[PDB]
Amino acid sequence: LRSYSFRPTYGVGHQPYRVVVLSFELLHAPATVCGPKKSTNLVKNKCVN
Amino acid sequence: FKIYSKHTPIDLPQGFSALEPLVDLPIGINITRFQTLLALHRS
Numbered sequence: 001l002r003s004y005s006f007r008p009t010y011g012v013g014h015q016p017y018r019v020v021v022l023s024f025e026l027l028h029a030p031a032t033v034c035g036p037k038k039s040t041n042l043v044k045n046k047c048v049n
Numbered sequence: 050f051k052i053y054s055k056h057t058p059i060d061l062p063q064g065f066s067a068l069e070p071l072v073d074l075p076i077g078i079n080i081t082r083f084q085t086l087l088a089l090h091r092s
């Protein structure tokens with residue numbers, strides 16, 4: 001195990017970058033995380049789809 | 050794992066009453082047996 005030595009005088013090739021990894025997939029269980037259903041208003045008394 | 054229930058205030062009596070769903074849980078778990086839990090007498 002080695003350590004890091006971050007300092008605020010460094011160049012870009014050594015500055016500490018924050019990284020987060022999102023690994024996601026479905027299971028045959030019900031989907032506990034969906035997306036956006038696009039926003040839109042609601043009209044009445046019109047033949048609509 | 051679905052649960053239906055109803056709470057109606059008053060050997061079982063005689064009557065008809067349909068039960069409504071309360072929860073629905075997408076668990077995936079298999080079930081083959083179960084037990085119950087009771088509140089004992091200690092005081």
Ligand SMILES: *[C@@H]1O[C@H](CO)[C@@H](O)[C@H](O)[C@H]1NC(C)=O
Pocket residue numbers: 077078079
């Ligand atoms: C439940 O048990 C059956 C065998 O009785 C098995 O084939 C099935 O894959 C099990 N279901 C789950 C979700 O593990």
